C-alpha cells in the first residue's frame, strides 16, 4: 500500500505531469493515474484541488534549461517541496 | 535541495518517464531532466545503468486499468518506491 500522504504525493506528481505536457498520450495516461491515487487515497477532494493548484503554480515557474521546458524537473521539485508539505499538514 | 540518493531517485523517475512514453515532447524533456540528475560522487556509472534496467523491467509489467491506459505513470511511481530500487541504492552506496 501507500500511506494517505504518499497517495496524495503520487497524485501531485501525476497531475503535474498531466498538466505540464501537451501530448494526449501522456495527459491521458497520467490523468488516469491521478484518478487512481484520488480513489485509493484518504485526503479530501478539497486537499486534492489545492494540490492541483500548487502543481500549476510550479509548472508556471520559468526554469533555466538544453531548450527543454523542464516540466519533469518542475514536477519532481513540487513533490519534494515545502509547499506541498504545508498542504499535507494543513489537511492531515 | 537533494541528497545523492534523492538524485538517483529523481534519475530513476525521469528515465522511466523518458523510456515509457512515445511522444518526443516528453521523451526529450524527461531525458534532459535525467541528464541533470546524473552525478557520480556517490553513485557510479554502473549504478545508473542498473537503475535504467530496473525502470525498463517496471515498464514491462502489465498493469490493470479501468481507463484502458497503459498506466506508465503508475509504473514509474512504483519504481521509485520499490525495494528493488532501494537495493540498488544500498549496493552502490
The CATH number linked to A92 is: 1.20.120.1620
Looking up cell 560522487 gives B41
Per-residue cell: B63 = 498493469
d(CA B29, nearest CA chain A) in Å? 6
Cβ-based contacts under 8 A for chains A and B:
79
- What Å distances lie between residue A88 and A17, A55, A83, CA to CA? 19, 14, 9
Resolution (A): 1.9
Compute the distance between CA of residue B56 and CA of residue A22 in angstroms, rounded to an integer: 24
Per-residue cell: B88 = 540498488
Of B93, B85, B15, the C-alpha closest to B52 is: B15
Determine, for residues B70 and A28 on separate chains, whether the beta-carbon distance falls below 8 Å.
no
Of B54, B43, B42, the C-alpha closest to B13 is: B54
Residue B12 near residue A10 (C-beta atoms within 8 A):
no
- What Å distances lie between residue A7 and A49, A51, B27, B64, CA to CA? 14, 12, 25, 18
Determine, for residues B74 and A36 on separate chains, whether the beta-carbon distance falls below 8 Å.
yes
Query: Domain tally for chain A?
Result: 1
Helix (H) or strand (E) holding A57: helix A45-59
Which residues form the domain of B81?
1-93
User: Least CB-CB distance to B36: which of A14, A26, A73?
Assistant: A73
Compute the distance between CA of residue B22 and CA of residue B20 in angstroms, rounded to an integer: 7
Amino acid at each position: 500500500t501507500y500511506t494517505p500522504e504518499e497517495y496524495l504525493k503520487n497524485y501531485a506528481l501525476s497531475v503535474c505531469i498531466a498538466e505540464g505536457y501537451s501530448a494526449k498520450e501522456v495527459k491521458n495516461d497520467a490523468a488516469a493515474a491521478a484518478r487512481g491515487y484520488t480513489e485509493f487515497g484518504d485526503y479530501s477532494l478539497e486537499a486534492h484541488t489545492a494540490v492541483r493548484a500548487l502543481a500549476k503554480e510550479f509548472l508556471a515557474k520559468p526554469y533555466d534549461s538544453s531548450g527543454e521546458p523542464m516540466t519533469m524537473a518542475k514536477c519532481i521539485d513540487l513533490v519534494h517541496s515545502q509547499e506541498l508539505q504545508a498542504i499535507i499538514k494543513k489537511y492531515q
